Amino acid sequence: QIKKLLVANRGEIAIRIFRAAAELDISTVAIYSNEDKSSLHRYKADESYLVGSDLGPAESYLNIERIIDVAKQANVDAIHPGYGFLSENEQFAR
């Protein structure tokens, strides 16, 4: 029932979630920041979007609004928060 997945995260966990989604024929979406325009998880998804030029380094995986803005612009059904960012965030999930 899930067509597209977005991972609100980076690095090994992102790639990991991507790999499962792919094995489930689910299309993948990745987010990245400025110094992560190199990080490998960006290239392991079907689609990759920058979370706002403006948004800095750590804060850009925290920005609830901008990340959801991305999720809409792609028609994503589901977000996997991974671990250690918005993964425990209440406001983000709501």
Next chain:
Amino acid sequence: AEISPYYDSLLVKLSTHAISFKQAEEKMVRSLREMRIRGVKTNIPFLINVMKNKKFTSGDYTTKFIEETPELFDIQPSLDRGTKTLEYIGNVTINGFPNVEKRPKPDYELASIPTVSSSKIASFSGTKQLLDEVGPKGVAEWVKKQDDVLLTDTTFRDAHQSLLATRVRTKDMINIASKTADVFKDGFSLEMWGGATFDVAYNFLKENPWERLERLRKAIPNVLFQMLLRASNAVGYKNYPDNVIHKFVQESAKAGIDVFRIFDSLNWVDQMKVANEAVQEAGKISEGTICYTGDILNPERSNIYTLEYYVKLAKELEREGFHILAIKDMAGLLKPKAAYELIGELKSAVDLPIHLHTHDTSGNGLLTYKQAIDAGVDIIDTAVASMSGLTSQPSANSLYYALNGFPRHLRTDIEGMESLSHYWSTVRTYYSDFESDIKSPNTEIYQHEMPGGQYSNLSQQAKSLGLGERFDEVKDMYRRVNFLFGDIVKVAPSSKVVGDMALYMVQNDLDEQSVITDGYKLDFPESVVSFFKGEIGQPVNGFNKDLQAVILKGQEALTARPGEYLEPVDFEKVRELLEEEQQGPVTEQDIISYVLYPKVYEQYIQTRNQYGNLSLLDTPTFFFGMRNGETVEIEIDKGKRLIIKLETISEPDENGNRTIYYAMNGQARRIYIKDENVHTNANVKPKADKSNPSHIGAQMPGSVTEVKVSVGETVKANQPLLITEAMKMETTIQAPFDGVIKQVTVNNGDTIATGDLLIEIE
């Protein structure tokens, strides 16, 4: 390291593991699909088919599984988008681009691009929404009601067809599409298709013009799209049966064309019926066009091209039921006062709205528009400042301000136009290799009447025949040819006829009398004989019977428009051929594109297969490739982009093949490209293995004077197989044993060094 045939072939052993046969099975195909090996062929797609197979996932299978399941040897070809992109950039980087001055990729002005939110654009209701609302008859009635002067922008088509040999790529157009949509929100239409764009898109720029139409369509959904349609052959290069015109119109309408400016290059109405009908069946706006020549101000110019001729012609186009009347002044001949008198009369004579197109080649362009506006013209063709002037349209930016304090306003957004102008000024920089010769207004236009570009094209052509010092005579002859042929409208391809004839007459010391006297022993240019056969149609005054005779040497001329002679094209047959030649996914747009441009279209495809969608490259990269250390970012789709870094290029090997070291988004990557050195001496030879009896090496630095053997030659020991040059001294290299040559590392004239491998013999 390479693979030897002496051990059983094992590339990689792959193993998957999970809770269920279903999950491990889908773990396997996933890892199989990520697998990529090159330089050799693999059993990869085979296994993929095996895993996917329901009978394998069933578990019930036996040893006879492969022999009984014939689908497993039916594997689909594997293209690679990314590699082909690397291949293109590599080629252009090393061996340059045709007609582009081989220079290091320039560091242009950045000049970032103005954009507008697509949700805002979606809220705009312009002339496109008006066509969908009130039909083509109703758009016309709306136009003639507008007190403001409505503009058509020509930046996407005519503007660069004039100034840049039509080289402006889709990429630069799509980049400002959203800004343009806002800027021209109240515009009548954007001219973005037809003329040379079809031809030039497929051939030179190697991009699909249909893609350009379709993408601009989505991005600019509020303004009318307009194309220029030549009555005889839509956008082709020869003649066509009527069903080719119809098809192309139907499919042009479907992909987003709303306004078709239909013109005949002789103002022959009868050749304009097909395009007209077709456009009407498509429910789109059909613009009926009068081309301007002569000078209605001057009664000595012609007894034919008078005010009464244009009036008569206009009323015939009205009874033909064109929704709009276009005046195509393709040579910028419409003088200010002429404009005011012509339009004024045309307003009174017909009820159609008048749409005026001029070129600024005399420098009086804006004056002409200003006068036309005064006389009540409904629509004019303009371009943004930086893409205007000279052989292009008059500038919209300045027309805007030129009108200040006069009783009629040009309905547009200047602020926007300034911005568009800035964008087009930086972008034009990319096209510097295709800049026109012309840098100045030219009023000799008014005597020889060469349209658009030609007065430079023909000078180039006249220099080729060594008449460079006698161009005035050529220009003089062009004018005489016009009267010799009976005073004709001169637009492609009729103007080509006159230029060809003129070149021909000057080159052959021929005048109006000798062309008839000696004509029995003269091979007149194909374009004139063609013209005198009836193949562009009928010129207003007809053909001079004796001049026709002398040129035709007894060939029949047509007794009707070129169209009625040809069989309808069997399009099913066209589809059959294409689907066989290609994969499978073929469309109607593919079909007429083939019909209209067979050889060109076939070449577009061989390029698509080899290099992919070149139209997605930014223009600098497309023309120059990449320099060392550079990173470029190629937009494939929303969220899908290739980040490529060129790291270094190696010296060429013994085959002139250079190795490019790329990084393609996170991955190391190596590509090979043959370098056309221009001469051969810079090739890096492999060092001979010294303790190898097969490998023959070079004993001294020298040259390859002569090559005597190639791959697969068998002669006895002591055969003189390679002649060298030590230092003004020839030494004849001989074979140590009877055997066969495996590799010859050199060709005649290559520099060699001490210990370089030359020959290998078994």
Next chain:
Amino acid sequence: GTICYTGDILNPERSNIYTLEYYVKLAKELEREGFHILAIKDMAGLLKPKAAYELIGELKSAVDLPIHLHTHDTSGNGLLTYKQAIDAGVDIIDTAVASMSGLTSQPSANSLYYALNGFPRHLRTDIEGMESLSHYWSTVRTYYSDFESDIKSPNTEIYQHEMPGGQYSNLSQQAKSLGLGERFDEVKDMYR
């Protein structure tokens, strides 16, 4: 006696100083000084067509001096301004040979000659001669390609910043040659 043109007499919001009445008064004053001719020097090509008609229209009444008009075609409305000046009764205009005209230069004489066809007033000159000179200058100009301006198109922003003749491209180089050649936008606005 020369009057340099700035502002825009067509736009009452542009200036309550550089109005028609200011120009008339300055003309009458220069006539009082005993100049033999009245020049209008439009150095920044700011004399819009309808403004030309009105200004020269009003000046012919105010003073008895013949009027000598000089503009630059930097906005691309040069010829229009001239044609409109001629309708207003202007005596002498500054033109240049086609191949030496346009953009920051004066309007093309060659172009004006024909532009006026059908109109009440003819340009007194020899086009066949002008065409012939034009060709000559077209080749000679070629010897000076290292000195060509960067300007290859008309610029209507001159109505905002009023930068005279050359300056625009000159001032861009200074900006580049000072590490501001990116933000020439704010320079243009700062000039204004």
Next chain:
Amino acid sequence: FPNVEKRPKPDYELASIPTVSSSKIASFSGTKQLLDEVGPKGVAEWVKKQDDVLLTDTTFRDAHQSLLATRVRTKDMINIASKTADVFKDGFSLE
């Protein structure tokens, strides 16, 4: 040479130089002659009377100051002087 791109002498098209004899020009009588006969005020008077628009050419001055940083040399002006004398024989002035 200053401000000139160090490169081998570029190829130039041949300039046909149209030429008028000095006696044909010595016979002309234009605005120069009028000033000698009538003075500045008379020249002004004569201008006011003319129907035609009169012109002042700027090729030798303001045209190349605008387009070519005023670099046009005497020599290039000198070569067409005699043709210019003829073309603009009815001109008001030459800037």
Next chain:
Amino acid sequence: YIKDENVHTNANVKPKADKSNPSHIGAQMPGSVTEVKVSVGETVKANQPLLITEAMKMETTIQAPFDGVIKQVTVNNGDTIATGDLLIEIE
């Protein structure tokens, strides 16, 4: 005068064409000679290919302006040329 024994192959300096001479055919653009199609003493017709050049990956074929005779061929295959160099003289 000493002939250089192919130690540059193409770095021969071509005399520039007298542009006011009809018999002189000069190079319109910089580029390379791809194929010499005629030699000295040969009779040619008008519009006959004499020479093929390659400028920027584009091949132009240089043709005889008038019926006549080749009197000097200035280039060989592979030689580079600059705008204005004499290539052929025909009468």
